[PDB]
Amino acid sequence: GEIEFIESSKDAGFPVINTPSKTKLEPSVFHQVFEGNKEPAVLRSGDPRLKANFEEAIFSKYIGNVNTHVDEYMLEAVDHYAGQLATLDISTEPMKLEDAVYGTEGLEALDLTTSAGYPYVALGIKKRDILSKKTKDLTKLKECMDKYGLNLPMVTYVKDELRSIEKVAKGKSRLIEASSLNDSVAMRQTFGNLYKTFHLNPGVVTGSAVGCDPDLFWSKIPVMLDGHLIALDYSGYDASLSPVWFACLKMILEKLGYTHKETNYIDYLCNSHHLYRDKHYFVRGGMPSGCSGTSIFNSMINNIIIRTLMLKVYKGIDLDQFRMIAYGDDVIASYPWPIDASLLAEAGKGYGLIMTPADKGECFNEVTWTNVTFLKRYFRADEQYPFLVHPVMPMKDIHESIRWTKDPKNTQDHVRSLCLLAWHNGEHEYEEFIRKIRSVPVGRCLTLPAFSTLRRKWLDSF
């Protein structure tokens, strides 16, 4: 993706978008008890911790576009992946508005907590001024959509989250886009049944883990991923995507029965108009992460990409023995024969993708079940029930999280959530985690699950 045009918002009559410049993250009562290195991402230009130019840094992910046609490797990649998805009988019928907005099986209700985007954000109109959970009112929503229509500008926000020392100093904060509520709803109507099928079918047919529950899903993954593991990472996957990958995605959607008209929203994602504070700008290419379906669409594109690279380097590959699962940019895959991931990565560079060894490894090393990660989690078979696999979030990451909070009122939910992650590291690690939590008086006011309870509920869940 590439920023093709930027200018001052007032010159086009857009008001300044007033977003917060102070982090909501504050040190928690556990900040001294545990060790950590991460701090809130830089949110503003004058941040004393910066050792680089902020505006430059946050937009640097837009590395440019390669401008190619959909080539022969892409075409075959799309056909093979499309063959798999056909299996699922995805309905290209519009999802009914009430289902798309207020929830249905496989598609949670529209988040009423996040930005309503433009123009609402400039009118002080919040999502809950238009929508109501208890009521399921579609009246105001219908008015708003009729009134303002579709294809509205996106609103760019800087993501308020913990980052490493390096990422803070380099100012490399992540950007998230808020689609207009109008566009979010139209996309959920148009692709909702697709969203639902993906969410209800994590695995190697969808090639997707979006919506997965790691406690359950982790035990299935090694059953599905039969061969020699394949894993590489991307740098700035979303913003690196060139328009040709969106062309691929449209081809695959149309093979699924979507009309050319119905795939128009993919053009909305690819060629986009954004408001950022006092600036407005146009982007060609790049997935605008935060819009409707971007995790799923990122995942679908990744399925196309990896197949493409395999076909291009290994002429004579049999993709029918290939398996992969993606969560956006995160891929874990297998093939019955060894595959040189460095070759794939170089082939990727040719398509304008930045691909590196798994987990910032030095070289494209041997990926094994011991050192592979997915969604930041390791895989550890249970000692007693070898067919059950623990998702293992590193204690280091759990420690980083507990040292900060955006609202202490939710301390109980926060610590309990971390407990659900921690116990997979084993009893000794868990009891230490609990010990340290209880070394603070708040820790002794918390209802914390026992290890044995956590293990029992987990075993029982299968």
Swiss-Prot record:
Report the residue ranges that make up the RdRp catalytic domain in this protein.
227-343
Task: Kindly report every residue range on the membrane side named Cytoplasmic.
Answer: 1-462
- Cofactor binding: number and manner: Binds 2 magnesium ions that constitute a dinuclear catalytic metal center. The magnesium ions are not prebound but only present for catalysis. Requires the presence of 3CDpro or 3CPro.
Cofactor dependence: Mg(2+)
Residues that hold Mg(2+) 1 according to the record: 233, 329
Catalytic activity from the UniProt record: RNA(n) + a ribonucleoside 5'-triphosphate = RNA(n+1) + diphosphate
In which domain of life is the source organism classified? Viruses
* Membrane topology value: Peripheral membrane protein
Q: What does the entry report regarding how activity is regulated? A: Replication or transcription is subject to high level of random mutations by the nucleotide analog ribavirin.
Where do the annotations place Mg(2+) 2 binding? 233, 329
Record's subcellular location: Host cytoplasmic vesicle membrane
Question: Whom does it interact with, and what assembly results?
Answer: Interacts with Viral protein genome-linked and with protein 3CD.
Q: What does this protein do?
A: Replicates the viral genomic RNA on the surface of intracellular membranes. May form linear arrays of subunits that propagate along a strong head-to-tail interaction called interface-I. Covalently attaches UMP to a tyrosine of VPg, which is used to prime RNA synthesis. The positive stranded RNA genome is first replicated at virus induced membranous vesicles, creating a dsRNA genomic replication form. This dsRNA is then used as template to synthesize positive stranded RNA genomes. ss(+)RNA genomes are either translated, replicated or encapsidated.
Which protein are we looking at?
RNA-directed RNA polymerase
Organism in which the protein naturally occurs: Coxsackievirus B3 (strain Nancy)
First-to-last residue of the parent protein present: 1724 to 2185 of 2185
